[model samples]
Target: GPVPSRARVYTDVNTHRPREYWDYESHVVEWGNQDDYQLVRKLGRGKYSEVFEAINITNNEKVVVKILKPVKKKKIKREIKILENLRGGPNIITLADIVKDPVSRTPALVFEHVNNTDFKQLYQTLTDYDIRFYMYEILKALDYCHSMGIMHRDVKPHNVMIDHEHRKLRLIDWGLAEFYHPGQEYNVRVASRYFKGPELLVDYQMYDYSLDMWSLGCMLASMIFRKEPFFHGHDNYDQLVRIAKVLGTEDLYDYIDKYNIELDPRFNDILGRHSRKRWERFVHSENQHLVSPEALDFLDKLLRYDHQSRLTAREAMEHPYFYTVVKDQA
Candidate 1:
């Protein structure tokens, strides 16, 4: 028989909420006035939408407008509803308005503007303490959402907006987010490749908010090790193989066996046996300043193959690595 698993905390969050609160599909969206904002410049574009730096004409305040690409109606409604649900949560992005192009009927999302530096350049300059400060800030957002029965399927540096001058952070892009219902299977195809969890690569679909924790661990590892992606995969299958190479192939098998998961046959050829690599080995001249006993221990607890073995966001926030950072805020 297979082992059973659920999040160590907030397991039945949705159960306590009213049915209408979590039923995203049943809610009708209220569209806002597009005339209130004018695009200033294109910010970025992803597969889902084109983002722009814009000005709220009514108030002359800078804002962000995301013009969504054509997708299912339900998907748009889901993102809108989740944003509304998480409106005031810690460091969660503020959704200003939801508007549509009157003629083209293309839907767009308006949000508070953040003067963000690209993580590629920003991470290189962050001090050891700065890393701890921001990582803890992100945990606040993660914990807040998990407590509300929402899973942020995507949790990567790119989705985290930071204004270095203001010392502000916002977790954005809820397009892939979903409300958690115990015992429900979710889409395996969520999160970026580098941040994907073990459950995702092996096709385990019953994962919960802990999935975000794995991605957060990946982000943390990359920041400390200076490897843009701590686990670099050529493709999805190679992703697990890359992870196995570091965490050991035997443990991966142990995890799969406990859950009665059968990995795709394609992995058979590439997943050769590998021993678990020590976290200390990654520290050296370049990253030693960022490395600490507490940090290594925190990282170890997060990157485990078993989702249940990983620390919850609240637990992670309390880890010793952030001891000074938390004290400074108090």
Candidate 2:
């Protein structure tokens, strides 16, 4: 059976932008000489692409090269167009050029080099202040992209490049980003399992920019709670129940009923009504300093079952968590 829709979670978002911002089909790629960049080492790999640490022969400068896997030409174009549209935004990665293998026609995206530390290692050492600093920077990235009518469908710790020593953050991985259109049903197969919003797990497709906020919320929860992942579901179906356990089935059901969402039957097999657990429950000896009042208030807003209730990136920027951080910087 098909998963149901939850139109209630998303109200009117500012998806209004000129067609030029999103008309990927019409945008042509400007190719760069692939020979100019030499692969130095393999950085990482994912389902759709292999990343490499490459250097440009002409300038002797290091760059990040992403060699996309064999995929439909249309998908390649979509990623290219979104990257170009988002170029020059604050905390956004610069797309240096697009290139391809002449014979196989494999596509590659070149980006400015960022000295990034893996979040798994980086987050463990951050202080209460350090977490707020990087988070504020991330909100800048999210707000800037959302304002451009772009939704970074993939917003997780891995996509955020942090240079903690230098106090810099760059949002990378535009491959999964898409332009938000009013009433458009997005593919449910986006975002990683741990960071996926409730709308995605329950198969709600008409989500909007608020989707990214939910991801940010999950990321923050893991940070403040000292949990590897705030929700550790064994599988995608279990992901929803894991969330239901903490957020409580009571509110989730109300959301389901209010939106007239036809709950996926598999969800019926395991779900039972439960009261929402308080966020304070996650605090302990080590993280007591990071779990402040503003942290709790801001997180409570972002992790709501109703997506519309989630703060816009711009609104999140004004939250008390960042407010105090801003005051200290001034």
Candidate 3:
């Protein structure tokens, strides 16, 4: 039988909120005039949305225009509800307006424009202090969201927009985010493949805000180790295989057993038992400057196979690795 678990922190947050707050589908949206915003240039595209850099003509200020693709009406409502609910949260993206075409009825979301540099180049240039500073900023956003009964299903670098010059960070893309309901089994298919946690890879649906912690750990490890993806899996099944290669096959089994999870039969063909690889082994001359004993300890606590064992975002912020970050701010 599966052992039940709940979030170590903020376990019943949603329970305290009125049903109207979490009942996204039932909420009515006030649409804004889409003509107020003019597209400047294409920013990026994803599976469900086309993002653009745009100008708000009414105020003459820059803003982001996210035109959501054709998805279920409930999915769109969920995002808007989550964003509205998390308004004013620390480092949470500010939604300026919600607009839809009058005739076409194509919906778009406007946001406060953040000057962001592509993380592919930015991560390599970051100083040790810069890394800690920005990471702490992200923790603030994560902790705030968790406290609000929301989990940011996507926590990858792409979703974290950083303006290094201003030392500003915003956790964007509430598209995949959802309210945390205790004992509810959620859809395992969320988050980008690279940032997916062990619970998702193993099809464990009863997860919580701790899942974001795992993704954050992956981002941290990538930055410190100079690896674009610390775990580069070729496919969905290979994703778990890649994790097992690092966390070890034995630990993986123990985690599954504790949860009474049934591994997909496909793994039987590709997965061969492997021993755990030490974090220190990944350090090299290029990445040694970013490595530290405290960092390794912090990362170890986050990238665990057991979701319950992973540090909560609030706890992660208190790790010794962030002592300097905290003190400097004080």
Q: Write the per-residue lDDT of candidate 3 for residues 75-159, one digit (tens) a residue.
A: 9999999999999999999998999867678999999999888656686577888888999999999999999999999999888
Worst 10 residues of 3 by lDDT: 117-126
TM-score quality measure for candidate 1: 0.97
Which lDDT tens digits does candidate 1 get at residues 1-330?
A: 445577778989898989888888888988877768888999899989999998999889999999999899889988998999999999999999999877777899999988887656676787999999999999999999999899999998779999988899999999999999888888999899989999999888889999999999999899898878899999998999889999999889899999998778898899998999999889889888888889899999999999988999999999999999999998
- The CA lDDT at 313 in model 1 is 95
lDDT of 2 by residue, 132-192 (tens): 8888999988888777777888999788887876888899988888777676788989999
RMSD, model 1, all Cα superposed?
1.3
Winner on TM-score between 1 and 2 is 1
State TM-scores per candidate. 0.97, 0.93, 0.97
In order, the Cα lDDT scores of the candidates are 0.91, 0.83, 0.91
lDDT score at residue 262, model 2, on the 0-100 scale: 77
Candidate 3's TM-score: 0.97
lDDT of 1 at 109: 97
Residue 126 alpha-carbon offset, candidate 1, angstroms:
1.6
